[PDB]
């Protein structure tokens, strides 16, 4: 099963970091008001 499948999870890492960006986006309006 030679494949280690490391790129795909890097993809879901990209969507995770995106979700963190949106999280900070909500955090700003939450700390503003």
């Amino acid at each position: 099963t030679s494949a280690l499948s490391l790129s795909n999870v890097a993809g879901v890492f990209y969507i995770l970091v995106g979700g963190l960006g949106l999280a900070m986006l909500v955090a700003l309006i939450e700390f503003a008001y």
């Binding site: 999280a23 900070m24 955090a27 939450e30 700390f31």
Partner: peptide, 4 residues
């Protein structure tokens, strides 16, 4: 970051 969200709490404090």
């Amino acid at each position: 970051l969200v709490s404090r």
